[PDB]
Structure formats: structure tokens, C-alpha cells
Design a protein around this ligand. Structure first.
Ligand SMILES: [Mg+2]
Ligand SMILES: [Mg+2]
Ligand SMILES: [Mg+2]
Ligand SMILES: [Mg+2]
Ligand SMILES: [Mg+2]
Ligand SMILES: [Mg+2]
Ligand SMILES: [Mg+2]
Ligand SMILES: [Mg+2]
Ligand SMILES: [Mg+2]
Ligand SMILES: [Mg+2]
Ligand SMILES: [Mg+2]
Ligand SMILES: [Mg+2]
Ligand SMILES: [Mg+2]
Ligand SMILES: [Mg+2]
Ligand SMILES: [Mg+2]
Ligand SMILES: [Mg+2]
Ligand SMILES: [Mg+2]
Ligand SMILES: [Mg+2]
Ligand SMILES: [Mg+2]
Ligand SMILES: [Mg+2]
Ligand SMILES: [Mg+2]
Ligand SMILES: [Mg+2]
Ligand SMILES: [Mg+2]
Ligand SMILES: [Mg+2]
Ligand SMILES: [Mg+2]
Ligand SMILES: [Mg+2]
Ligand SMILES: [Mg+2]
Ligand SMILES: [Mg+2]
Ligand SMILES: [Mg+2]
Ligand SMILES: [Mg+2]
Ligand SMILES: [Mg+2]
Ligand SMILES: [Mg+2]
Lengths: 121, 50, 67, 81
RNA sequence: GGACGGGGAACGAGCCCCCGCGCCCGUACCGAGAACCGACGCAGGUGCUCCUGGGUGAGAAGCCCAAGGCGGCUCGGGUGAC
RNA sequence: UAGUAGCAGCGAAGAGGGGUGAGAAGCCCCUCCGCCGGAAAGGACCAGGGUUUCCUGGCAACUUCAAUAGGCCAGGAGUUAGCCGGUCCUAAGGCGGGGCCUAAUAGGCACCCGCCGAAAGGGAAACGGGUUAAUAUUCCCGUGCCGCGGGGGUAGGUUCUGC
RNA sequence: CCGUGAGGGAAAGCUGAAAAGAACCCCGGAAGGGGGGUGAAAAGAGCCUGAAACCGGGCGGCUACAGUGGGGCAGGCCCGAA
RNA sequence: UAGGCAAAGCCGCCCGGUGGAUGGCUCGGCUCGGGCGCCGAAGAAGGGCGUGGCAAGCUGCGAUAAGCCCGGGGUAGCCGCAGGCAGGCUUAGAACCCGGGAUCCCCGAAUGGGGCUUCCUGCCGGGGCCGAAUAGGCCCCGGCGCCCCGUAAGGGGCGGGAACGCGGGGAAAGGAAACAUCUUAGUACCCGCAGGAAGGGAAGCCAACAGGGACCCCCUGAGUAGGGGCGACCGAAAGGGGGAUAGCCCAAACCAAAUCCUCGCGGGACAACCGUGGGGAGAUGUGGGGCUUGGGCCCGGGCAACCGCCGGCGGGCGGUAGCCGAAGUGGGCUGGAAUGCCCCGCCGUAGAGGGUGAUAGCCCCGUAGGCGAAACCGCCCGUGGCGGAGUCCCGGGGUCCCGGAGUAC
């Protein structure tokens, strides 16, 4: 459950050895001020189908849909944050979730609504 | 030997099954980090004590 | 889609036996292709094996429940 | 008890010329058990069973079917060919 | 295998015809001047352990030649001083 | 040191022509020349080795040189038994339980009981031909044998014994 | 992995923010080389930095009638931007 | 005469090749502190072999084989190390984590018997197959170890574990400037046997006429007394200060079967126990009584009697997953990219620490702080059920009986 130790070696070992259900917590991204008043929560784990605004990096200011989430890498792919390889294919830049802000929420999942009510309280 | 006991033969079978390098797709999957196997041996050089 | 443990429990023993026989035959055919180097659906052998394990698990539970 | 069929060049030649199917079975299976299993599963008659253990530790059985059943037809029916 | 004894049944053979069953493990290849041991594809050791045609000959000696194998005791060429 | 020593000595060695190939003294085919022939060499085979076997492909490394070769590398394949061996028996000997000994044991063993101990001793029964890239007394064809059990016939028996 | 065995036993970490892991053209039998690309940087998968010994090339000084290294003085050639 | 002018060779710098130092990094080590603490015939630990679509090793797993089922947590992704090619699984709730189950090859205490090959093989009982057969043969499943306890049914021991604990056997090297007594050392090591701790523990004590008051461990007494080729060297105890605190039973006197165990049936919180019947133990004494504030024995008085067995029900707390948790991603600059610089804000019970494209209180995880469990486990509290021969408290009387043997010596 992520160590309580203050030692950097144990903090990092917790991060790299975290099982999948803990790695989900690293997907949290801040909600936009508009969504914060509508939903009443400040953060949600990024989900495929959400729409995020990128706040840092080369694609800063680009808004797009999340197309894929990698729990192992703790990275997300966002429409628009792309480039082409030498063979002409379109590839996605892996963006850390702490660098994006969620501007539209995908709420078609009933299980996701339970998380919102828990944090709204 | 021509006349083998089965127990010895099955230990020889295990060594025969394990004597091979990692597949080429393993080399690709690990970015060339895994290229050798400790079970790789040559019948003339590394002797089993079977 | 794939047969869930709930649906397997509602089956009569005869249907479970017949399903088990089909899977073991399918596994024999698939392992033959694997030895020949080419498998039509490379992800299928794993699901057949776990399905067989599922049926055998429910079989043991149902016997124990009456025991 | 049957793990798979053998469909090599030698095995297919023995199917056509000698009415034999070649199978890999569990290493502890005996000729009696192999003959019973083949008859029960495939509804054929077994004339005799020859067995060997391969250098990779697997038991292989050359199973000769009686003179009313076709080894080639059985392999086709099973869809292993 | 035979004989010498004891007990039992009413059937019944070592002869002729006919029927059935025979599990399990080994089985490739080298077996050595490169597949064994000697750190080696090592002139050693293990195993020449067992077998071998014709001529000459006392000879399973040497020499020459079969059957059969080899030119892989895994550098090549030139020169023709010491 | 140094592009130096060694890659000689132990009684065989190559050559011509053709093919393959980017490339050939060296790989493949023929011809010529040689060595072994009671064998550093042909036939068989135990232990040991353990896939080195066979097929296809290959040449970064490996082979005292080269290589298109390979016991090397990659991919695939291959070992079929009532009668061949083990298995059975005991040998010299050994192990276990009991018992006796021991501070004690995983240490000892005269005793009792059991078992193990030979792929060269004893010991049931298979030979010839053909087949595969690679197995062959194992597969296939033909002709048999052994053990155990059964059916029929026969001799014989049915108080008593065959001639 | 070594020893029959009791036992004994190494070496070996690091692309990049992201594979964007090098398209395409020419040469080579091939490993590969040249051109041209990616990246802030080749950091090029033999991947951070990349010292010395050592070897190659360039440059400065010497070099076949003169016996070697170190120090001082005087001089020649060469460098002397910060 | 010197220069153009140069062989092989020498020195220095630059570039390149080789090499892998240095520097930075760190999911590794080490030391210290705290916790927690046994597993195995219900077949362990350890080992062999197998197991993935492409899979050699490691890791996991066991023919149901990187896995099967149920529940809780966790929601949208997943298919270990391990960044590839495929194909799938998953919103009918997966992956993942926690609890409980299932499966669990061969060898292994290994336990039918063997075992020169982790494999082979016997008998009995049941089942299947080949077969004309009910013969014969083959195969599958179960039982079959030794030594013991028990009337029997039944039950026990065996093997493992990093160190620690208890009993026994038991050196030398070295030191003494040689060396033998001695020391090293009751050490190394060996053999046996336990527990989560072990061992010790309740005065035939210590003291000195003043008094302590079971035991173990820590500090001291103390390198004191004492032992010793009185050499090297070895070495207490009582007492004092602390940690912690706890006291009882068997036998016997006296009574004499009033006793215990097991099974069937009825009752009884799934128990103890009660009623009844059978079996076993028991006069070579079960049981009652008794334990220095000695007891037995006799008389009287009193309940605050005393002593023991069961662990059901309710409640609480804790452990084994988790959930919530403040405050900038503000303007400009540099930059591939800011967490940096300049300017402006804000939180703080939170400025422990980590991550994020360079250095972040306010981007994210977290932190201060708060909450939480279907299931399993542990601790505490309240309540409940039951048994005994008054065994309990106080006084008097006793002068009779008991008070541990190859022991003390
Ligand atoms: Mg060798
Ligand atoms: Mg066989
Ligand atoms: Mg052969
Ligand atoms: Mg040689
Ligand atoms: Mg000839
Ligand atoms: Mg020469
Ligand atoms: Mg020379
Ligand atoms: Mg000669
Ligand atoms: Mg030659
Ligand atoms: Mg000759
Ligand atoms: Mg001769
Ligand atoms: Mg020979
Ligand atoms: Mg070959
Ligand atoms: Mg070949
Ligand atoms: Mg090979
Ligand atoms: Mg024997
Ligand atoms: Mg052959
Ligand atoms: Mg570098
Ligand atoms: Mg200057
Ligand atoms: Mg020069
Ligand atoms: Mg295990
Ligand atoms: Mg056994
Ligand atoms: Mg023990
Ligand atoms: Mg010392
Ligand atoms: Mg001394
Ligand atoms: Mg001395
Ligand atoms: Mg204690
Ligand atoms: Mg104790
Ligand atoms: Mg002492
Ligand atoms: Mg009594
Ligand atoms: Mg939170
Ligand atoms: Mg926060």
C-alpha cells in the first residue's frame, strides 16, 4: 500500500514493485474547475475515453481524448500528442497523468460513479 | 551406453530439452538484454554428471 | 461468449460430461497443430485448458456438496 | 491419456501403408491402457500396439488398427491432418 | 527331468486338429590418432575386447594384393647455403 | 618480444578434367596415383558419452591453414520385440528389521528373519528375405518356437491293472 | 562451472523525454560503407561520461662523423587566443 | 660550409582506434532497534521431472500445471521477470490485493517389498479389458513400516527449521617467550532431546544473636575471597540496586470402592454434566483427605464457604486488503522539456519522503489527521451451564499416628 518509510530506497521500491491495484492511484489527474463544481471532486484516475488538457511538455495546450492507458508504465496516450516515425506511421507520446487536466469525464460506467460519490462526500 | 536405465534416460531427456538458447523473439522482447541461457551446453565440452 | 461457472452449475451432469469430452478432443487436435508448428488460433489452447479445469473444479464441488 | 497425434512424414507413411496411427501418450500408459483408450475414444478395433519412449522423454505408440478400420480415415475425421 | 509312494474323480492325455493371452524398461549414433578419460578435434590411456580372404613363408612374422575402407595421424608452395 | 616460434619427425600423397558458387588446390562427380588389409585403417560391440545420428539450410564464431565442408550453427525429424538383453537365480559379498553391544547414534554384528548382489556365470522360446533419409532377429512377408489356459478327436480309463 | 566425493564456486549494472530504434538512394557475397534522415545531443542498440597504458594518422623539433637520461646557462626552429 | 633534403629511429601535442578508469546514478548490501515465532503420516521441508501458442533460464504452478472456485477490496483494463509476433480474456465486473477452498506427478520421515539409477515389483479385496470362455493373462483403485499405549474401537513416536535452549562425549594448535602440571576449554566438534522461548523456581536457604525471605535475568559486590610449576593465568558467593512478581501438588497418616475411562440410548448451550445399560482399570488401593501459618485424629461455632469442569451467548478492541485527506499547474524569461530565475498568490495538525521531459509545500503519490472487513485469526470484558465426600473460616483438645533409602554418610 505504498510504504510509510521516509527512506528514498523504500519509497522507490514501493513505486516500482507496486501491484496493479496500487498503480491505479498513480493515474489521478486534477479535474478542471468546471468539472469540480459539477461533480464535487478534485481528482479522478484518468480513464480511456476521458478528454484531457495537456499542461506541460511539447504538446502543452493540446486537448484530446485518452485512447490508451498503460498501468505498468503509468503512461497515457492522448489524441493529438502524436508524431510520425521514419516509416510514416503515427505513434503516440506516452504522457504522465500528473501532467494533464481532465476536462470531460466518461461516465458510462456504473462502477465509476461509485468512486465519485465516495470523493464528493 | 546401449543398455540404459529409464531413470538415467529421463535425466538425459531433461538436459536435451533444456539445451538451447532463448528464442529470437525473446531477444527482441527484452531489447537484447536476454541473449544466452545458462542451460546451453555442448555435448563435448560441458559434461552432465548423469 | 465463454461459459461462466454459474451456467456450468445449472447443467445436468450429462451435459457437463459431454462438454468435457468435446474440450479434451479439441485439446488433442490443438496440441497436434502446436507440435506441427502452426496453430490456427494461437490464443485458444490456453482457454480450452482453463475451461477443462473449470469443469473439473465444479464437478468436485458438486460431489462434495452432496457428500 | 492421449496428448496429441504424430503427423510427421514417417507417421503419415505408416498410416497409409500399414494402417497405423501414431500418438503421444502419458509416459506411464501401458499397451493395455493405450489399446483401451483408442477403442473407447474412436470406436475402432486395435490389432496391436508398439510403444517406445523418445529421447525427449515422451511415450509414443504405433497403434495398428484391425482390418475393417482405416487409420487415414480416422485422422481425417478427427481433423488433425 | 525322472522314479518311488499316498489320496481323489469318472473321465481323458506328452499324440493330431483348433482357439486365446504374453505386461514393464533398453533399442538412434560413436565405440575412438576428432563422439570415452586425460583443461584440447591431445602420438598417452581405455579396447585390439571379440573376428578376418589370396601369394610367399614355420608362422595370426614381414612384404605384396583382395573384400572393404582411407588420402582428415586436418597447413600449402618454392629453394636445394650452413 | 614479433608478423617471430610452432602448424616437420611417430614408414599414406597427391594430380587432371568437369560441376557448384561472389569466391575453389581443398566442397560434389569421373579418371589417374597411392596407404591399410590377423589392421594407429576392414567387421562387431561393452562401459562411458548423450543426440554427437538423419534431412534441409548456413558460415559471425568454432577446426593449428582454407572452405561453398563439418562431430560447428539454425530449423525439422528419428530408437516399434512373448521368442534380442534386462527382468529370474545364486557367487564372493552386502543391506534392513529383531536381538545383543553402546553415554549415544546415522557406530559394531557372532545370532534369528528377510531381501539385495552378474546386460561375460546359471537360465523358456525366431529364423530367412524385403523395406527407411534415419529402426530392424523389433516394421512387412513367409515359415516357426515357448509358457500358460481352453475346445474337439484319439490312445487310454471307468473294483484292478498299458503292450 | 570445478572435484569420484566430502566439498568448492565466478564474471556480469546505465540508449533516449519519447523508439522518434535510423525511411529512402548508391556500392558490397556478407558483416558493412557512402549519401540522406531522427533527436537538444548519436546518446546507434557493441548504446551516459569515456582517463591511462597501448596502436594508427597528422603536425612541430631532431635524424645516417658521433655514446643516449636529469639540471643550469647560451642559442636555433616552432607555438605563444583566453 | 651550412639550406632545399627526406632512411630506420627518438621526443611532444592534436585526432582516431583500443580499453573501461573517473564522475554522476542506485529496485542491492551491511549494521542497529522493534515485532513475531514452530512446520510434518490430513504425508512436511528438500529434491527430480513436467508445465506457456511461438518459451531456453529465473519466478510461479502440478496432468485442473505463470493456473481452477467462493467471498471481500479494486474499476477498466489484463495475459510474471520481459519494451516482440499472434490470438484471446474482461462492464454477465477481469487483471490485481486479502481471506477461505480445489487440484497437488515421482523421489523424499517415506511407511507393502526392492532400489547399481527419483524407477521396478508382491499379496489380498473390488473394478475394467483381451478373449468362445466363469479359463488364463493384462490394467486401474484401496489396504498391507517399525516400536509402542489401549479391552477393543482407536491413538502415539519418526522427518524438517537461520540462530537461540537442555543432557552427554570431548581435542589440539596456540600461551606459559622451551615444556610435561596448567591454560586454551568443558571451547571447537560429535551424539541425543525440547520450546516459541528453554532451563531455574517455593528453604534439610542465607546469616550472626541484627535480621533477610521462591526463581531467572540486568547493574554492582569484584578481578575482592580463593585456586595456581602460588607461574602464566583462573575466579566466586552472600549482601545492595533493578526488571518482574505467585504459588501449589503426588505419596503417607485417617476413611475403604464412595473412583476413573470407553461405548449405546434419553436429556443437556453442538460442551461439561445428568439418568440408565454394557465393557475396561481398580484392595499390589481408584477416589476422598493433605501440603510450614505441618498434617492426620476428637469437640464446638460460622457461610464473606472452599475447590474444580465447560467455553455457549452478548459486547469491545486488535491483526490479515483498503478508503478519505489542504493549498497555483498563475504572468514573463531561458530551454527540447521547467520543479530553475523575476513578479504575484495560497495551505499548513500536513515543509517526513518519493515520482513527474532540469532543482516542486500548493501537478501526482503520499504526510498531519480520520475512517474501514463478507471471511479467517488473536486478546479482553460481561453473562451463562455444571461437579465434589464441608474439603473453607474461627476456637478448644491433643501428646497418639504420618512426614519420601542403596538415600544421608
Ligand atoms: Mg571428453
Ligand atoms: Mg519396447
Ligand atoms: Mg543400432
Ligand atoms: Mg588430431
Ligand atoms: Mg577395394
Ligand atoms: Mg613446409
Ligand atoms: Mg619454423
Ligand atoms: Mg607399409
Ligand atoms: Mg594431407
Ligand atoms: Mg600396400
Ligand atoms: Mg601379417
Ligand atoms: Mg576397428
Ligand atoms: Mg552428421
Ligand atoms: Mg548437412
Ligand atoms: Mg549442435
Ligand atoms: Mg537379484
Ligand atoms: Mg543405422
Ligand atoms: Mg559511450
Ligand atoms: Mg596570450
Ligand atoms: Mg623517417
Ligand atoms: Mg516441493
Ligand atoms: Mg518404499
Ligand atoms: Mg524432532
Ligand atoms: Mg586463537
Ligand atoms: Mg610454549
Ligand atoms: Mg613448541
Ligand atoms: Mg519461560
Ligand atoms: Mg520450563
Ligand atoms: Mg574455567
Ligand atoms: Mg489413592
Ligand atoms: Mg488520497
Ligand atoms: Mg495533494
Amino acid at each position: 500500500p505504498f510504504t510509510a518509510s521516509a527512506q528514498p530506497r523504500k519509497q522507490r521500491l514501493s513505486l516500482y514493485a507496486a501491484p496493479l491495484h496500487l498503480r491505479r492511484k498513480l493515474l489521478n489527474a486534477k479535474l478542471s474547475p468546471e468539472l469540480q463544481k459539477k461533480l464535487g471532486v478534485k481528482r479522478l484516475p484518468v480513464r480511456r475515453g476521458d478528454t484531457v488538457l495537456i499542461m506541460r511538455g511539447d504538446f502543452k495546450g493540446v486537448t484530446g481524448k485518452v485512447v490508451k492507458v498503460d498501468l505498468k508504465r503509468v503512461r497515457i496516450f492522448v489524441e493529438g500528442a502524436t508524431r510520425t516515425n521514419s516509416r510514416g506511421q503515427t505513434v503516440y507520446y506516452p504522457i504522465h497523468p500528473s501532467k494533464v487536466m481532465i476536462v470531460d469525464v466518461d461516465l458510462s460506467d456504473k462502477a465509476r460513479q461509485k468512486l465519485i460519490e465516495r470523493r464528493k462526500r | 551406453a546401449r543398455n540404459k536405465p529409464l531413470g538415467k534416460k529421463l535425466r538425459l531427456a531433461a538436459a536435451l530439452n533444456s539445451n538451447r538458447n532463448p528464442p529470437l523473439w525473446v531477444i527482441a522482447k527484452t531489447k537484447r538484454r536476454v541473449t544466452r541461457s545458462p542451460a546451453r551446453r555442448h555435448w563435448r565440452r560441458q559434461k552432465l554428471k548423469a | 461468449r465463454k461459459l461462466k461457472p454459474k451456467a456450468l452449475r445449472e447443467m445436468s451432469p450429462e451435459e457437463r460430461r459431454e462438454l468435457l469430452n468435446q474440450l479434451r478432443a479439441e485439446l488433442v487436435k490443438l496440441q497436434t497443430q502446436r507440435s506441427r508448428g502452426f496453430v490456427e488460433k494461437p490464443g485458444r489452447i490456453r482457454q480450452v485448458r482453463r475451461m477443462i479445469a473449470r469443469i473439473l473444479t465444479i464437478e468436485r464441488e458438486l460431489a462434495k456438496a452432496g457428500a | 491419456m492421449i496428448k496429441r497425434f504424430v503427423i510427421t512424414e514417417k507417421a503419415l507413411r505408416l498410416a497409409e501403408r500399414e494402417n497405423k496411427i501414431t500418438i503421444i501418450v502419458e509416459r506411464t500408459a501401458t499397451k493395455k491402457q493405450i489399446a483401451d483408450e483408442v477403442q473407447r475414444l474412436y470406436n475402432v478395433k486395435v490389432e496391436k500396439v508398439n510403444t517406445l519412449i523418445t529421447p525427449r522423454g515422451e511415450k509414443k505408440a504405433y497403434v495398428k488398427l484391425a482390418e475393417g478400420y482405416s487409420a487415414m480415415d480416422l485422422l481425417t475425421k478427427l481433423g488433425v491432418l
